Amino acid sequence: HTDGQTNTVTDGGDGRYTNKDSDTDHRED
């Protein structure tokens, strides 16, 4: 009901450091 975001985290493939990426996503609307 097409307001609102989806959930978005990314962990950068790896590395073992704090490779904490972000994003966006929505009900693309």
The 3-class secondary structure across the chain, one letter per residue, is: CCCCECCCCECCCCCCCCCCECCCCECCC
Residues in the chain: 29
* Four-point Cα dihedral 26, 18, 14, 23, nearest 10: 10
Q: How far apart are CA 9 and CA 20, in angstroms?
A: 8
Which residues on neighbouring strands pair with residue 26, listed in sequence order? 5
| Cβ within 8 Å of residue 23, ≥6 positions away | 8, 9, 10
Task: Please answer whether residues 22 and 10 qualify as being in contact, where contact means their C-beta atoms are separated by less than 8 angstroms.
Answer: yes
User: Cα separations (Å) of 17 from 2, 21, 24?
Assistant: 36, 12, 22
Method used to determine the 3D structure: NMR
Q: Taking the CA atoms of 13, 9, 22 and 3 in sequence, report the sign of the dihedral they define.
A: positive
